[PDB]
Amino acid sequence: VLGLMGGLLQINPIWNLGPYKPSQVSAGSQPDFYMMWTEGLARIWPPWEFYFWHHTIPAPVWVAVIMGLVFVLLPAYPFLEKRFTGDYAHHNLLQRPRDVPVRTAIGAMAIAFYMVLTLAAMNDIIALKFHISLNATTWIGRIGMVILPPFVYFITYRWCIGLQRSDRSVLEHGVETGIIKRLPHGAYIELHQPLGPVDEHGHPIPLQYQGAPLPKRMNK
Amino acid sequence: MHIEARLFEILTAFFALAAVVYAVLTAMFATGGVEWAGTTALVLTTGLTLITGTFFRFVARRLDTRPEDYEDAEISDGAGELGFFAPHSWWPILISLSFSTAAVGAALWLPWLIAAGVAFVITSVCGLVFEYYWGPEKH
Amino acid sequence: ELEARRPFPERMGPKGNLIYKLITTTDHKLIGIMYCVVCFAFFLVGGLMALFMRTELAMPGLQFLSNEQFNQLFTMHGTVMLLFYATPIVFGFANLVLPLQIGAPDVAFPRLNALSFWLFLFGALIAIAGFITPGGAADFGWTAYSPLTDAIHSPGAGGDLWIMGLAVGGLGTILGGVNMITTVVCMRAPGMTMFRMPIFTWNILVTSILVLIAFPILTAALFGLAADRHLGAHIYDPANGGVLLWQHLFWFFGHPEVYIIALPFFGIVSEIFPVFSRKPIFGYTTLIYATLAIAALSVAVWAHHMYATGAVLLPFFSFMTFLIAVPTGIKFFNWIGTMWKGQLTFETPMLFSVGFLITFLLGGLSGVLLASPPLDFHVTDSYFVIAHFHYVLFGTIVFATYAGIYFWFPKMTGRLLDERLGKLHFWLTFIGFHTTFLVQHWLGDEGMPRRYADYLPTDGFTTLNVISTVGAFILGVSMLPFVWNVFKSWRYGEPVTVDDPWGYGNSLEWATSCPPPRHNFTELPRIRSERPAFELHYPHMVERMRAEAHVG
Amino acid sequence: HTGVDVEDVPSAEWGWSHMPIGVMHIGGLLSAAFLLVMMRGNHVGHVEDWFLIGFAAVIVALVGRNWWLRRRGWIR
Amino acid sequence: SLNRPNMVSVGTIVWLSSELMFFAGLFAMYFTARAQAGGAWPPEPTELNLALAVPVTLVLIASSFTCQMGVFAAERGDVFGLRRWYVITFLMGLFFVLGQGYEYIHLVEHGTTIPGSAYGSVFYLATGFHGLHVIGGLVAFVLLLARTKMSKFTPAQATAAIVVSYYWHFVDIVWIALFATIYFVR
Amino acid sequence: MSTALTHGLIGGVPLVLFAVLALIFLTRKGPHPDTYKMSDPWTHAPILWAAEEPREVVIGGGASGKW
Amino acid sequence: ELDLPYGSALTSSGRISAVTEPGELSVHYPFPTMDLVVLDDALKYGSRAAKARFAVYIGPLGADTAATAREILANVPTPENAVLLAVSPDQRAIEVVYGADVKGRGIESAAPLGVSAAAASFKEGNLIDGLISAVRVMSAGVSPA
Ligand code: HEA
Ligand code: HEA
Ligand SMILES: [Cu+2]
């Protein structure tokens, strides 16, 4: 795959550019996609400086401390989670992301924040190709940086619990087959299919959840 | 089915009449002759209703009475097993997202977005068609 | 024997009960609810645009708007209100109560249903998202006349989004129509023939046929227009017959559209009247034939919108519109006959239906007045036309939709909407509407054409605009009681523990539990007429229904 | 775990499933304050502060509704 | 119960009628702007090579019979005949659309373009949409063959085969109409 | 026409009309039965309300009191 | 072969299909809605924290009151694991009944407390209010098992 896409797609054509000279510049000045969040954070951070006696604290200091805070909060997460939840046992079996709603919501919020910061770095390209104002994109990023993470958190929490309920329903009843009958006194039933034993009158006895995925389609 | 075919035959008769009348009334009495834009729409709406009515007519002639078409009937007649009605599926929203991507890529003239949208539409439609036919995994 | 119950049904439901069921659903009831909610959101957006228009149109002079912004406002108002609120609300009511009325467990193709809904939503969102463009949304009319929507004139990036959003929405509508026709034809109860099904179902079938006839030609025209805008395709140049070609195509699409959004609401009111009149529907087969006649005639009158171009055969279209005026008259007379000598009780659905009757009569009178060429030679492209189609549109969609909501809210929820709030809502709506649109006849008879952003004080008609904007603000305030009533009555509100909360019901939907189960039915009754639930709940009435069914 | 009930979250003993509500309330208040202060250094325009104040008011209204409804026993 | 008149058949029929209305719109576009250009209404730089328009029409007509043989073999429960006939149909439909592309190239080479003329516009826009419909039909063929490969043959597969078959018949006859209008009437 | 009075009417007529209509309609009696007051006898049918919470005749105890 | 009072009809199943005239309700409870809701979340959340159905009865007990109360308790879905509270506002009598399965969980140390709270709240003329108080205290008393 790497050979194919290194032969067929072009990356960094330095000859179209020129040698570096401190007097000339161009319009697309982005770094590779793993520093775009740093660039976007520098773009959408407001101009807050402090001037006191004989000194000056400029704006990019903010970018510096935020970057450092991210790089410090990444390696220290397991200890934070074990301090907050209070669970210190050995674990060798993994969790499905739908069984831990709070951590999944935290992760989705962080990913949304990262995506906002990365898209705020291609302001020029977005505003040029898609006809949007430039100041509009700056303010969109500046406000999204605050209102998108919590919205994503809320939706992800509710979505995880919905998935849990969908699992419990197929545990209680059987797998829906999609076949309909008419039951001579004009009633419509849907012909479930049990996953275990059955009682005297044909209804399956409910199973217990065991942390493993359950089938939902009859053809699987 | 006998009444649906009759409905479509009525509609086709009226549409053909109107098309011919409009054509021959604009051949004369008009500024530039035949109008050529309403005439076409009228003949081809006639053809639409004609196709549908003819299909219904053949299916009716090739069929025995049905509890729906039949009066005099009781609910014990239709007692049986209906077809297969799909329960929950999430592919429609992905199909719509792909088609919307292609459409917005056609609005603003962006060929790469159109290509991506077409690829996504092919992928989503393939997923929808194969959903209840994939077998168990082979390991 | 005692039997255990609850002090009050549950208000909301568990956490995580809806969001995932919303994405993977395939049952028609949830999809109908989604239809209704999003269509009302779009209604609010369009109404806000209309209020901006009114508050500018009062007080001569450009106080806070511009010419470009005014043009964009009326364009987007017309587009939203006609294509993103009415055409989908039709399928909302269809998905709600058609399978219940024919006695079926589901629609024919259950995934095509969700596909249609999502296509509608995303096409609407695409078309609306032209306001975030620095140039603005589309600025031509709602109708997009022939050379004004070219590439030279109207060069912005809002027209492209307009065209593509309309294309996507049209695809969704075509799929919905296919599904509805197939469902009404194939899936049906084992006892009811096609001359026993309710009138709402017949209107929906006919409307679906019209949709299949109308929308593909609009998609063809729009693809031609996009080709002309992005490739310079010489399709609509005035050098060829390009100016009248577009008008012919567009109006051949656009008149069947208004009849599409008109017929099912005729069905709704014809279905509400007998329940509150305590009588059968007057002239069943007559109403069916009138519907078929309107359907057949609606496609051969498209050119009564092009009188002032001097390029059409006037007697043909004038005579045939005069002809289409008749079946609506027989329909009206059948409604009045169904109300004749009954036992009337005016709850909110009946009240809204009577309002519909009055308003639609006035609008249709003005329309048949408009149908003669020598009079359209003066009143066309003026505010007389605006008053006319606002009467018909409002009286049909708004009033019949509120009637349908107040009628079928229990059958889909299990609660009852408040009645004092309903009466307040109705009276506010009625007064505000008749005070905002009545003076526009006079306002347009004397010279004041449509689509003007400004006028001079030396001209007349500066008080009539003030009266109209006062009425528009009354209409705008009239929406708070409705949304408050729906917000409160969905969770609280008197529960319904019986079938048929409006006694003397029909149509086989009032014979199943008030919130219907999944697959809609636990048992069916024996079907012998078009009022099966009435004969089920009152078995001592069939002898009297068969004996005196022909006096008249 | 700290505790929620299984009828609310079915998988409550398989993973972290509860976050205190004061965190969310005060976080919403802090985000509203951030949006409000973000209009310091007014750079020749007021189309933006309308949006800022609108979003801040909506956030404060949501937080206030939730707090008031929980205080009166209408939620749990 | 199962109410023998099939459901997929009714759906496909009504949708095919709607698509016919779409092509009606395109035809109405073409006929106007032909009553305007007087005399030699195909301008001089265009000459329709008939020596290549006939072979592709005949291969499409033969593909119709191939598809019909396929559905015949389908209605009785054997899949390999279906597969063979549908592979043949796919091959010759691909050949048809390749020939059409070759004509487009040789026509734009020394003559008509979309922005160059009005006849060029109506011609390209009337034939390219039909080409797109043909390509959609090919994709449908591929998907149907894969679905027959991946599980057991039941009546549902037969219904899918039938509906795809007569969709293809529709596209074939509408091409017959387009060709007879463009090349012979002029 | 006297911009002040134009704005005044546009802002005042709708809300005034809302007020009169609300005082006319929202002050009536609803269909809800009026509350039962224990000074008077009890005529309603017997009432039994369960809890429904845990999904799926020997007495263990008892108590009493008469106000 | 019953009366089916003017609108009810027995279907092909055992289900009854009743109707109502356009201008009435189908509950007729002589209490406000905003107290029914409070009694309901009391009855639900107190039954969650105790693993025992809580019931409430208000009709008459025109016999040996404890006899009739234990006659009524056989109508709860799982009577053996259930707690009933009976009240007769005419005879002014309070009765609390248990089940055999719910015992040894701190019940009789809580039944007289609930009875006393219900009486002390009834002595002013608060029916639903005293019912709520009694259900609260008894549910807080009983332990899950
Ligand atoms: C939803 C609905 C809707 C409906 C139902 C109608 C109904 C009718 N419309 Fe209307 N119309 C529009 C929406 C609608 N219209 C719109 C949106 C426009 C223009 C939009 C645009 O240009 O931008 C428009 C424009 C429009 C025009 C052209 C305006 C122009 O000059 O630009 C004309 C006339 O040609 C017309 C005629 C009619 C007629 C004859 C009917 C008839 O259907 C109505 C007949 C009705 C009756 C109620 C009769 C009542 C019957 C009896 C009581 C018997 C009475 C008998 C006698 C008097 C003979 N309409
Ligand atoms: C189905 C349709 C429909 C509906 C309902 C309406 C509704 C209204 N219309 Fe519209 N109208 C058209 C269809 C419709 N219209 C069409 C087709 C045209 C001409 C098209 C064109 O020329 O191109 C038109 C044109 C048109 C004009 C003239 C434009 C021009 O100059 O030519 C005017 C005003 O005079 C007008 C007014 C109104 C008013 C006052 C309402 C009132 O009914 C609406 C009252 C509504 C509300 C106020 C909503 C309430 C809003 C709030 C509560 C704000 C809340 C906000 C948020 C929560 C977001 N309409
Ligand atoms: Cu006109």
E17-56 CB burial, b ≥16 within 10 A, e <16: bbbbbbbbbbbbbbbbbbeeeeeeebeeebeeeeeebeeb
- Phi-psi label, residue E139: left if phi above 0, alpha if psi -120 to 50, beta otherwise: alpha
Q: Please provide residue B4's backbone torsions phi and psi, each rounded to the nearest 5 degrees.
A: -65, -45
Q: Residue C322: phi, psi to the nearest 5?
A: -55, -35
- What are the distances in angstroms from CA A162 to CA A99, A153, A207, D11, G125? 11, 14, 19, 11, 45
Q: What SS3 class is residue C84?
A: coil
C-beta neighbour count of C278 within 10 angstroms: 12
Contact C191, C527 (CB under 8 A): yes
Residue E68, token pair as written in the block? 């019909």
Cβ(E125)–Cβ(C227) below 8 Å: yes
The Cα–Cα gap between A145 and C100 comes to: 47
Name every chain B residue with its beta carbon within 8 A of the beta carbon of C191: 67, 73-75
Q: Which candidate, F3, A4, B92, A94, places its Cα nearest to that of C113?
A: B92
* Tokens linked to E115: 């922005």
Mutation choice for ligand 2 from C390, C402, C483, CB with most ligand atoms inside 8 A:
C390
d(C-alpha A163, C-alpha A166), whole Å: 5
Phi and psi dihedrals of F37, rounded to 5? -115, 125
Q: Report DSSP letters for C422-482, one per residue.
A: HHHHHHHHHHHHHHHSSTHHHHHHTT-BSS-S---TTSS-SHHHHHHHHHHHHHHHTTHHH
Residue type (1 letter), A9:
L
Cα–Cα distance for residue pair B106/C164, rounded to 1 Å: 8
Nearest-CA neighbor of C353 among C366, C341, C344, C364?
C344
Contact in structure between C141 and C100 (CB atoms under 8 Å): no
Chains D and B touch (3+ CB pairs under 8 A): no
Half-sphere exposure of A113 (CA within 13 A, CB side): 13
Q: CB-side exposure of D61: number of CA atoms within 13 Å? A: 6
Atom of ligand 1 nearest to the CA of C142: 23
Resolution of the experimental model, in Å, one decimal:
2.9
| Pocket residue to mutate for ligand 2, from C81, C85, C359, C429, most atoms within 8 A of Cβ | C81
Asked if C7 contacts F50 with a C-beta cutoff of 8 angstroms, the reply is: no
Positive or negative CA dihedral for C60, C61, C66, C68?
Answer: positive
Q: What six digits make up the tokens of A147?
A: 């209102």
For residue C124, give the nearest of C182, C80, C82 by alpha carbon: C80
Distance of CA C526 to the CA centre of its chain: 34
Terminal-residue alpha carbon distance, chain B = 50
Query: What are A189's strand-pairing partners?
Result: A181
Question: Are β-strands A179-181 and A175-176 bridged in parallel, bridged antiparallel, or unpaired?
Answer: unpaired
Contact (CB, 8 A) for B39 and B26: yes
Which residues have C-beta atoms less than 6 Å from ligand 2? C 44-45, 47-48, 50-51, 53-54, 74-75, 77-78, 81-82, 86, 141-142, 386, 393-394, 397, 436, 450-451, 472, 475-476, 479
Domain ranges of chain F: 1-67
Query: For residues D41, D42, D47 and D50, what is the CA-based torsion angle, rounded to 10 degrees?
Result: 60
Measure B31 CA to nearest chain A CA, in Å: 45
User: F51: how many CB neighbours lie within 10 A of its CB?
Assistant: 28
Tally the domains of chain D. 1
> Closest Cα to residue C318, out of C374, C273, C260, C246?
C374
For residue B99, give how far its alpha carbon lies from the nearest alpha carbon of chain A (Å): 18
DSSP A50: B
Give the Cα separation of B98 and B115 in Å (integer): 11
Chain D residues in contact with G41 (beta carbon < 8 A): 73
> Hey, what are B55's tokens?
């299909």
Query: Atom 38 of ligand 1 has which residue's CA nearest to it?
Result: C367
| C1-36 CB burial, b ≥16 within 10 A, e <16 | eeeeebbbbeeeeebbeebbeeebbbbbbbbbbbbb
How far apart, in Å, are the Cα atoms of A61 and each of A51, A67, C33, C428? Answer: 13, 10, 52, 59
Atom of ligand 2 nearest to the CA of C471: 40
Q: Of C7, F43, F63, F59, which Cα lies nearest the Cα of G72?
A: F59
Ligand 3 centre distance from Cα of residue C307 (Å): 7
Residue A209 neighbours by CB under 8 Å, 6+ apart: A167, A168, A171, D10, D11
Contact E86, E142 (CB under 8 A): no
Contacting residues for E32 by C-beta, under 8 A, at least 6 apart: B36, B37, C240, C241, C245
Q: Are C385 and C371 in contact (CB under 8 A)?
A: no
Closest Cα in chain A to D34: A146
G82-88: strand order across its sheet: F48-49, G53-57, G82-88, G93-97, F62-65
Question: C409 near C416, Cβ under 8 Å?
Answer: yes
**How was this one solved?**
cryo-EM
Assign 3-class secondary structure to C87-155: HHHHHHHHHHHHHHHHCCCCCCCHHHHHHHHHHHHHHHHHHHCCCCCCCCCCCCCCCCCCCCCCCCCCC
**Structural domains of chain C sorted by starting position, each given as residue range(s) with its CATH number in brackets:** 18-548 (1.20.210.10)
Name the neighbours of B, counting chains with at least 3 Cβ pairs within 8 A: A, C, E
Q: Which residues pair with C40 in a beta bridge?
A: none
Domains in chain E, ordered, with CATH? 7-185 (1.20.120.80)
**Residue C443, CA distances (Å) to B69, C67, C436, C468 in order:** 56, 21, 12, 10
**Nearest alpha carbon to residue C98 among C191, C6, C185:** C185
Domain of residue D36 covers: 1-76
Ligand 1 atom showing the smallest separation from residue C301 Cα: 35
How many CB atoms within 10 Å of residue B91? Answer: 19
Residues with Cβ within 8 Å of residue A35, at least 6 apart in sequence: none
* Residue matched to tokens 């089938």: A215
Tell me how close the Cα of F56 comes to any Cα of chain G, in angstroms.
Answer: 9
* Residues contacting ligand 1 via CB (< 6 Å): C 142-143, 258, 261-262, 304-305, 321, 324-325, 328-329, 332, 361, 364, 367-368, 370-371, 376, 380, 385, 389, 392-393, 396
Q: What angle do CA A14, A34, A17 make, to 5 degrees?
A: 15
Helical spans, DSSP H, in chain A: 2-8, 36-43, 60-73, 77-85, 101-119, 123-129, 134-172
Bridge-based pairing of strands G93-97 and G82-88 is: antiparallel
Q: Where do we find the tokens 């505000």?
A: C432
The H or E element that residue A175 is part of is: strand A175-176
Yes or no, beta carbons of B85 and A180 under 8 Å apart: yes
For residue G88, the one-letter residue type is: S
Alpha carbon distance C164, C161 (integer Å) = 5
Distance from C-alpha of C226 to C-alpha of C356, rounded to nearest angstrom: 39
Write down the H helix ranges in chain B.
3-27, 38-61, 91-107, 111-129
Q: HSE (CB half, 13 Å, CA atoms) of A191?
A: 16
**DSSP H or E stretch at residue C536:** helix C532-537
Cβ–Cβ below 8 Å for F62 and G66: yes
Chain D touched by C526 (CB under 8 Å)? no
Q: Do A133 and C523 touch (CB under 8 A)?
A: no
CB nearest to G17's CB, from C3, C502, C537: C537
C-alpha triplet C354, C195, C543: angle, nearest 5°:
80
Measure the CA–CA gap between C179 and C191, rounded to whole angstroms: 22
Three-state DSSP class for G16? strand
CA distance C526 to C544: 18
| Cβ-Cβ contacts under 8 Å for D53 (sequence gap 6 or more) | D36
Which residue has the CA at smallest separation from atom 33 of ligand 2?
C50
Cα–Cα nearest to C324, from C262, C379, C249: C262
Instruction: Give, in order, the Cα–Cα distances in Å from D6 to each of A155, A168, C428.
Output: 20, 12, 48
Contacts of E among chains (3+ CB pairs under 8 A): B, C
Nearest-by-CA chain E residue for C208: E14
Q: Do E7 and B83 make contact, defined as CB atoms within 8 angstroms? A: yes
- For residue C539, give the DSSP letter: G
Ligand nearest to the CA of C367: 1
Note whether D49 contacts C: Cβ–Cβ < 8 A: no
Could you give the CA distance from residue C484 to residue G38 in angstroms, rounded to a whole number? 22
Task: Report the candidate in C540, C384, C504 with the shortest Cα–Cα distance to residue C449.
Answer: C384
C14 vs D contacts (CB less than 8 Å): 7-8
Q: Which residue in this structure is represented by tokens 């506010």? A: C428
- Closest CA of chain C from F42, distance in Å: 17
Q: Does A138 touch chain D (CB under 8 A)?
A: no
Distances from the Cα of E101 to the Cα of A117, A215, C182, E54, E60, angstroms: 46, 47, 38, 15, 15
Instruction: Please return the burial class of C456, using the count of CB atoms within 10 Å of its CB with bins 0-12, 13-18 and 19+.
Output: exposed
Alpha-carbon gap, residue B80 to B87, rounded angstroms: 20
Greatest CA span in chain C, whole angstroms? Answer: 87
CA of C401 to the centre of ligand 3 (A): 29
Reference G79, options B49, C272, F51, A131; nearest CA is F51
Q: How far is the CA of C370 from the centre of ligand 1 (A)?
A: 7
- For tokens 């429904």, name the residue: F52
Name the residue among B7, E18, B129, B100 with its Cα closest to residue C177: E18
SS3 of residue G84 by DSSP? strand
- In this complex, the chains that touch A, judged by 3 or more CB pairs closer than 8 A, are B, C, D, G
User: What CA–CA distance (Å, rounded) separates A215 from A167?
Assistant: 9
Token representation of residue E145: 């063959």
Lookup result for tokens 């509860």: D18
> If you measure from the C-alpha of residue C46 to the centroid of ligand 2, how many angstroms do you get, rounded to a whole number?
6
Interface of G with A in 7-26 (CB under 8 A): 12-13
Q: Give C185's contacts (C-beta < 8 A, 6+ positions apart).
A: B1, B4, E10
**Could you tell me the end-to-end alpha-carbon distance of chain G, in angstroms, rounded to an integer?**
46
Helix axes C399-413, C348-370, angle to 10 degrees: 150
